[PDB]
Amino acid sequence: SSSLKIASTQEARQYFDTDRVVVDAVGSDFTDVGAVIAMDYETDVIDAADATKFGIPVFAVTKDAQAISADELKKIFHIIDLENKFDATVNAREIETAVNNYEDSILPPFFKSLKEYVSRGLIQFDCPGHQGGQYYRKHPAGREFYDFFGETVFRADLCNADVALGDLLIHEGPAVAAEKHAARVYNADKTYFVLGGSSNANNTVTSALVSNGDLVLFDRNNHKSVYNSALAMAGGRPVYLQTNRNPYGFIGGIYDSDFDEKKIRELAAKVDPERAKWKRPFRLAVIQLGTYDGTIYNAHEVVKRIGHLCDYIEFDSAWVGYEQFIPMMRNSSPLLIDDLGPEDPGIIVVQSVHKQQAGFSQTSQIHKKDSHIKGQLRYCDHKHFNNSFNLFMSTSPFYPMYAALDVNAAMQEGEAGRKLWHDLLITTIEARKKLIKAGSMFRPFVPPVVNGKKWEDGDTEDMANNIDYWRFEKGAKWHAYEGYGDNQYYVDPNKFMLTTPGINPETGDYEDFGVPATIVANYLRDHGIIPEKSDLNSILFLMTPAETPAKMNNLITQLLQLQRLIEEDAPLKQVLPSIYAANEERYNGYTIRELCQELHDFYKNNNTFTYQKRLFLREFFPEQGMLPYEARQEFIRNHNKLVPLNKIEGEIALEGALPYPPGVFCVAPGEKWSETAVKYFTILQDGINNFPGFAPEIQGVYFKQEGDKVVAYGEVYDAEVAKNDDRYNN
Amino acid sequence: SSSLKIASTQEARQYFDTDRVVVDAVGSDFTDVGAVIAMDYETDVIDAADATKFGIPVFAVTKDAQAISADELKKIFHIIDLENKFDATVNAREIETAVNNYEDSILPPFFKSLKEYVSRGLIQFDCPGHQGGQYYRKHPAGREFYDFFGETVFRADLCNADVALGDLLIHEGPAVAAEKHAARVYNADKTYFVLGGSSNANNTVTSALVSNGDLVLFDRNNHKSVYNSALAMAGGRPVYLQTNRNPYGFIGGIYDSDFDEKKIRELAAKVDPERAKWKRPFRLAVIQLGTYDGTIYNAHEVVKRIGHLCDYIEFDSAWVGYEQFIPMMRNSSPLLIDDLGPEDPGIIVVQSVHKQQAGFSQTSQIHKKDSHIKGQLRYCDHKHFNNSFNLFMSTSPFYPMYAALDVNAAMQEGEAGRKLWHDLLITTIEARKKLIKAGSMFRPFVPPVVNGKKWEDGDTEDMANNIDYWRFEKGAKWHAYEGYGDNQYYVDPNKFMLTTPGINPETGDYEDFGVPATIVANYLRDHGIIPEKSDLNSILFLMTPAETPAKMNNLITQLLQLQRLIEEDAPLKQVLPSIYAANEERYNGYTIRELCQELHDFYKNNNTFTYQKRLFLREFFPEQGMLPYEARQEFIRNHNKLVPLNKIEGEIALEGALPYPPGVFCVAPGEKWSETAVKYFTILQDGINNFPGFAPEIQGVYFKQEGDKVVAYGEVYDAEVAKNDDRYNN
Ligand SMILES: *Cc1c(COP(=O)(O)O)cnc(C)c1O
Ligand SMILES: *Cc1c(COP(=O)(O)O)cnc(C)c1O
């Protein structure tokens, strides 16, 4: 027991002697216990130690060992004979050796090395220049920071000259040791540890595979990181697949139909020989496994329906990663597709370990699963893939940030790991029942009825393993998703999503009254609860085993409290203190209902959710005036100008239009501004200039303050400036 | 005093009452003190409090205030009349208000906000998914990690849904607030906080300015990050400038001559019109301000000699940043070039804040100083420069890592900051004197004689402000640098460098006996001291105000101890325990002198340092067979094969050859393997296969295990594979 303590029951106490460490009772969560020591009859302690699925060695003290039943013997490690004092020293050695092996076995390779390295108190003259955080504590501000985070995070901040922790770049020693454990845990062929966010992780993927002018099959929901890297950077040629959207504006998956061999090819107008010739016209297809709004794909049906058309497939799964550890979710896992022939695509998975797994912000993994085509000329080897990695991977990775990727792997590994997640479904499934039965107006976006009974009337333990309760059925009265098919999509259970009053189910039109989600997000924040995101008529909360019932019931106290107030038409001053404070003029003497109604009508009258649909509907994509790689260059060269929003229609944008919702590009670079877009943006822009303290987050557009109102402006192609620029012509 | 304590003298104790906080004597370093309280006659305490240049408010308790001299009054903030009890409460209020303002004034904007945000205990449902590190503590390995780094580093790990700390991407609120303070502190026009290492910082710079086929003036010493981003990535065309090297193999600056307008242009053979036409044929010139081995440029003579030939200039100053804060070093600072006309180049500075400043690994800044040409078509605005920023900046920066860039700015700011650095010159200058006077065989790479007397016989305080003692004179008996000129280059004082026995000064040839620096690096590490790097006959130690005399004398204890043993020909077992252990066979019965001599002869007989020169000498650059952007594409497309080292001469490399020393590319991508290179690498390769436990670090080359020896192999162009690949031809 180096750091680990020892859990003993009061009776067992007097009978063991590894009194070198910290002993403590059992009502423990057993997470800092290296050995458990109890009396044989104290069977519930042996059971508690057991269920955790942790593997803590249990020692049962007896006075009649021959009497312990086989069954209990299947739960313990060693027996301690209380009536024998000659064994007192071997007893202590056994316990100590046990604790030490327990620990030596739970810690991942890199973390264990780093931890031991720091235990040496080496005199560092290498870089970081802060060396031990000792530069920091010499200055008063440096000292506040040093005492704020603590001496350790600095002590363990090391670099390349600390060879005992290996080489993280070309992967050697503990650095690669840990990456290989990640592989074993995730069922991949190589895991690359990325410390620059899945943003830079994608940059590695695309920049390794895609060559200039190569055909990229594009999921239209893709994060800016894919657009820019695969298309604008690598110079690939996208061939988009339209997306399902709905009255709530929710980001859905790809149109069931868009998955047609025949269609895709025609749809591959782009390079007729590339397409109308090849077995696989696409170098890569990049698809969003799980979207921000809870739609998870059946990785199994995609690889089958489009694998032959692409050399590799990148599943950008930043919003997931855990579906491989939740039984009912196995179909969604692409790394659990064990039967890949030489004919199907090398599969690749990019996941932000910080988002919904255990990791510090900026930590992600790249799982490489492509041995099935290891022969091929299309096959991208490690030398090539590590070349890319090294284009974006810093020459000086933050070490404590690497150990986080390492401890997350062991945390997902084993039944204990998969037990942690199950327990979360039980909590989550209960918080939702509580909200629903409690009468909340904010309702979990889940199937109303399932198996004749209603969703909240199911056995939670059944719902925690029964996918029937988490699936978007083909033809949904409730989800509104139009172009989906069977056993194609499911609802991500760790995306606690709630919808707000304002949108009608059956009818799919708006209602007369609606409670903009923003009013709710703000209320929450004002009461010490930070929501992840809140669109127009929905608010989202991100789940991981960190959740505890108290915390779930903490969110619900506030959700019921905000409702009590909206129905009682309280004063807008009271419900949203701060917004009223700042915008006291504009919101003078308002009631929440005043605002709710007002905001509500804006989008209602503005026919909002109609525009959000077309934006991702193929019969409404903008018009590619310039290829993405091209539009960039023009931008880089300064051949552009700032057309105002209103008269920018049909102008070629040199940057993507990134509004919220949904926060994906709406006009890719090189695409010429569409009538749709322009209008959606105008609803937003005017919404900004009408509801101060409620303005939607936009990107790729700039707001010039035009007297009373502010005004959007975008960087557009200027063929004239370009035209007359003698730097390029000849 | 929120966290800040209070330093009072025993006499002053009984006279003040802000007994709400922690009070403590004065023998303080004053770094956790918000107010200092003493008796008027205790003048040395008021002085100690003063010299720190911290700005701590001093309160002087008196019994005859009319008697305190003017001079002392210029040192105190407020007077405390001990003989007045009615003022007891206003006295306490004053002290408390004082401490609170002191603090509110020392903390940078972002740190202060993050710190206050965490003080609220908000219930986080946003991402990171670990939310508070509470996911981690639920698992035994997660718990070891959670207890290892502590609760705070996790608590303050936030994202976008935590709006109160602003928007770090598009820069708003506390995030931009801090970035602007960095600008004020650094004298730039915009500072961009980069959390992906100067590696990604460079990717931002080049990727914003350089357009495809643009002309890049290339410092041949440039880090892989520049080669790859400006050339291999942006597809720029380099025009190299040869580099000064020496018998120690040390990375020097650019050849004084290479800086000739006429030469540069001819030298610009590349695109005759681009050159033999334009005022500025170059879009960018990327130059290494300060190299790994101590040579710092005079930023003032560069901009003057080559500014007109380029639109912008990127000074990759990752090995520096502090020369702007050291008086004698101002010439080297580019941001302290205040007189920039519309005619001269927008100046940009990239610095790794973690390297030799105060920051966590992966932290760097990009200083944008280009307002002087803000009119121009060549002028790269923020919208364009933030576009690049956002290509590599993660959509989820690690926040604690951002506050590090923030506290580093305040730490450099003010006389207190510039006082911290000076003090370091005084320690460092004294450690070297000690080594030299003590008779060490490892000698600081400094001018032997200066001002008639010898270097270690100067007034240290004079040497800490006198550049004469840190400069490579034109024609040096001692530095061996050949192509340098006057007041062109200086020796970086915060790069504690020592050379080893083995190379002859006067003669510039090897000696008969030599002590490979690796022997020393290894000894050191074996005794709890981590050197930053150790080449063939030199070992480097990186300095910052974190150094303390005890630590300096700690290194020296070990340096004298290793010497005592080398002269006494100890057993190789004893001097290098571990190396002997592992390689017990090979080094059996060895004495250190046996190895020293052996290793020594290897490079001697191998004429090593001659090859290292030509490698950066223009009349010995490889032959560009393929432009860098091209060679990559071919690599990406798989048109390649693994030619072994020995028969790889004159083959086109698809990856740079990265040996150590010096750790810069020796064969850029597309360049065909040169005779020089091949040999240099063969010295290394054979050295690996001869001195196990002493193998040089290589990259871009692979070692296939050929029976007894291992073998280097590089990715070379394969025009045939290429030739027959029907995917590209038409
Ligand atoms: C978060 C996100 C990214 C961007 O990566 P970071 O890890 O946040 O730096 C890329 N793809 C998807 C689907 C994402 O949600
Ligand atoms: C360190 C270095 C880099 C690489 O940047 P990191 O900060 O280490 O990620 C780029 N340029 C130079 C001159 C460097 O020394």
Chain A residues in contact with B119 (beta carbon < 8 A): none
Cα separation, B110 vs B158, in Å, equals: 13
Where do you find CATH 3.90.1150.10 in chain B?
421-600
d(CA B146, CA B130): 11
Identify the CA nearest to A338 among candidates A374, A305, A371, A386: A371
Strands B443-444 and B215-219: unpaired
Angle of helix A109-118 relative to helix B140-149, nearest 10 degrees? 30
Q: Which residues contact A569 (CB under 8 A, 6 or more apart)?
A: A591, A592, A593
Amino acid at B559: L
Helix (H) or strand (E) segment spanning residue A502: none
CA–CA dist B568, B79 (Å, integer): 65
Question: What is the Cα–Cα distance from B75 to A724, expressed in whole angstroms?
Answer: 65
Residues 6+ apart with CB under 8 A from A172: A166
The per-type count for chain A, helices as H runs and strands as E runs, is: 27, 27
Top mutation candidate among B199, B243, B314 for ligand 2, by most atoms within 8 Å of CB: B199
Q: Are A132 and B542 in contact (CB under 8 A)?
A: no
Look up residue B9 and give its amino acid: T
Q: Is the CB of B396 under 6 A from ligand 1?
A: yes
Task: Output helix, strand, coil percentages for chain A, rounded to the nearest 5.
Answer: 40, 20, 40
Q: How far apart are the first and last CA of chain B?
A: 75
8-state DSSP, A393: S
Query: Which residue's C-alpha comes closest to atom 2 of ligand 1?
Result: A318
Q: Is A655 in the pocket of ligand 1 (CB under 6 A)?
A: no
Ligand nearest to the CA of A229: 1
Structure tokens at B256: 């004084």
Beta pairing partners, A514: none
How far off is chain B from A207, nearest CA to CA, in Å?
Answer: 8
Structure-block tokens of residue A206: 């695309």
Token pair of B24 as six digits: 């403590």
Task: Identify all chain B residues contacting A352, using CB atoms and an 8 Å cutoff.
Answer: 396
Query: For residue B15, what is the DSSP state?
Result: T
Q: Which of B577, B159, B575, B210 is nearest to B401 (CA)?
A: B159
A126 to chain B: closest CA residue: B532
Q: Which residues lie closer than 8 Å to B604 by C-beta, 6 or more apart?
A: B510, B514
CA-CA distance, A360 to A404, in Å (whole number)?
7
In chain B, CATH 3.40.640.10 sits at: 108-420
Domain with CATH 3.90.100.10 in chain B: 601-730
Within A583-699, strands assigned E span 623-624, 640-644, 671-672
Which residue of chain A has the CA closest to B129? Answer: A356
A57 lines ligand 1 (CB under 6 A): no
* Own/partner pairs, B238-242, CB within 8 angstroms, 24+ separation: B238/B628, B238/B668, B239/B215, B239/B264, B239/B267, B239/B268, B239/B270, B239/B282, B240/B618, B240/B621, B241/B217, B241/B267, B241/B618, B242/B483, B242/B616, B242/B617, B242/B618, B242/B619, B242/B621
Residues 6+ apart with CB under 8 A from B416: A139, A140, B52, B53, B54, B55
Whether A346 lines ligand 1, by a CB cut-off of 6 Å, is no
SS3 A559: helix
Q: Which of B194, B537, B641, B673 is nearest to A197 (CA)?
A: B194
Distance, in Å, from the CA atom of A565 to the CA atom of A515, rounded to the nearest integer, reads: 12
Neighbour count for residue A29 (Cβ, 10 Å): 11
> Which CATH number is associated with domain B1-107?
3.40.50.220
CB A349 within 8 A of CB A317: yes
Inter-chain CB proximity A129 and B357 less than 8 Å: yes
Give B31 to chain A, closest Cα distance, Å.
5
The answer for residues whose C-beta is within 8 angstroms of residue B160's C-beta and 6 or more apart is B126, B167, B396
Q: Distances from the Cα of A683 to the Cαs of A518, A534, A659, A665, A695, in angstroms?
A: 16, 17, 11, 17, 11
Burial category of B348 from C-beta neighbours within 10 Å (exposed 0-12, middle 13-18, buried 19 and up): buried
DSSP string for residues in B415-458: HHHHHHHHHHHHHHHHHHHHHHHHT-SSEESS-SEETTEEGGGS
Reported CATH class of domain B421-600: alpha beta
List the residue whose alpha carbon is closest to atom 2 of ligand 2.
Answer: B318
What Å resolution does this PDB entry report?
A: 3.0
Q: State phi, psi for B564 to the nearest 5 degrees.
A: -40, -40
Which residue, A546, A420, A322, A427, is CA-closest to B133? A546
Is B363 a pocket residue for ligand 2 (Cβ < 6 Å)?
no
Give the start-end residues of each E strand in A413-555. 443-444, 449-450, 453-454, 489-491, 495-499, 529-530, 533-534, 538-542
Check CB contact under 8 Å for B150 and A152. Answer: yes
Strands, E assignment, B175-236: 190-194, 215-219
Four-CA torsion B333, A396, B127, A532, nearest 10 degrees: 40
Distance from C-alpha of B405 to C-alpha of B361, rounded to nearest angstrom: 11
What is the Cα B22 distance to its own chain's centre?
Answer: 38
- Choose among A270, A275, A349, A272: nearest CA to A310: A275
Structure tokens at A396: 């000086």
| Ligand 2 mean position, distance from CA B626 (Å) | 26
* Nearest one of A353, A380, A80 to A207, comparing CA atoms: A380
Residue among B464, B467, B499 nearest B486 (CA): B467
Tokens of B65: 């205030």
Catalytic, B279? Answer no
How far is residue B344 from each of residues A43, A725, B313, B380, B488, measured CA to CA in Å? 82, 21, 10, 14, 20
> Does B316 participate in catalysis according to the annotation?
yes
Distance CA A188, CA A3 (A): 33
Give strand pairing partners of B452.
none
- Distance CA(B279)–CA(B215), nearest Å, equals 13
CB contact under 8 A, A545 and B138: yes
Q: For A280, what's the count of Cα atoms within 13 Å in the CB-facing half-sphere?
A: 21
Q: Is A419 left (phi over 0), alpha (psi -120 to 50) or beta?
A: alpha
Among residues B112, B224, B355, B367, the one annotated as catalytic is: B355
Structure-token pair, residue A125: 């003259």
- The fold of B108-420 is Aspartate Aminotransferase; domain 2 (3.40.640)
Q: How far is A415 from chain B (nearest CA, A)?
A: 12
Q: Give the residue from A289, A293, A281, A229 showing the smallest Cα distance to A254.
A: A289
Please check whether residue A322 is in contact with residue A494, taking contact to mean a CB–CB distance below 8 angstroms. Answer: yes
Give the three-state DSSP class for A588. coil
Solved by what technique?
Answer: X-ray
Query: Is the N-terminal amide bond of A661 cis, ω within 30° of 0?
Result: yes
A496: exposed, middle or buried (Cβ count in 10 Å: 0-12, 13-18, 19+) = buried
| C-alpha–C-alpha distance, residues B247 and B476, integer Å | 13
Range list of H helices, B193-298: 197-209, 224-226, 261-266, 272-275
Nearest residue in chain A measured CA to CA from B204:
A392
Q: How far apart are CA B64 and CA B76, in angstroms?
A: 15
Compare CB distances from A362 to B356, B397, B420 and report the shortest one's residue: B397
Q: Which residues, listed in sequence order, are joined to residue B296 by a DSSP beta bridge?
A: B290, B490
| CA–CA gap between residue B327 and residue B6 (Å, rounded) | 33
Which residues in chain B have Cβ-Cβ distances shorter than 8 Å to A638? 377-378, 384
CA-closest residue to ligand 1 atom 12:
A318
**Chain A closest-CA separation from residue B417 CA (Å):** 8
Cα–Cα dist B320/A585, whole Å: 52
The CATH code of the domain at A601-730 is 3.90.100.10
Region for A424 from its dihedrals, namely left if φ exceeds 0, alpha if ψ lies in -120 to 50, beta otherwise: alpha
Residue A223 Cβ contacting ligand 1 at under 6 Å: yes
- Mutation pick from A103, A125, A378, A379 vs chain B, by most beta carbons of B within 10 Å, is A125
Supply A137's token pair.
């504590």
Q: What would the two tokens of residue A411 be?
A: 């945390």
DSSP codes of every residue in B252-264: --B-GGG--HHHH
B499 lines ligand 2 (CB under 6 A): no
> H helices of A379-499, where?
382-392, 400-412, 414-438, 460-463
State yes or no: is A600 an active-site residue: no
Element (H, E) at A466: none
Count the Cβ atoms, other than its own, within 10 Å of residue A599: 21
> How many angstroms from the chain centroid is the CA of residue B721?
43
Core vs surface per residue B287-323: b (16+ CB within 10 A) or e? bbbbbbbbbbbbbbbbbebbbebbbbbbbbbbbbbbb
Q: What is the DSSP string of B337-367?
A: -----TTSPEEEEEEEHHHHSS--TT-EEEE
- CATH code 3.40.50.220 region(s) in chain B: 1-107
Q: Which among B239, B419, B654 has a CA at the least distance from the CA of A388?
A: B654
Rounded distance between C-alpha atoms, residue A282 and residue A342, angstroms: 16
Structure tokens at B459: 């007034």
Please name the residue that has the structure tokens 């009859």: A41
Q: Is B405 within 8 Å of B180 (Cβ atoms)?
A: no
What DSSP character marks residue A230? I
Protein residue closest via CA to atom 4 of ligand 2: B199
**Secondary structure (3-state) at B125:** coil
Give the C-alpha separation, A703 to A644, whole Å.
9
Ligand 2 midpoint to CA A650 (Å): 43
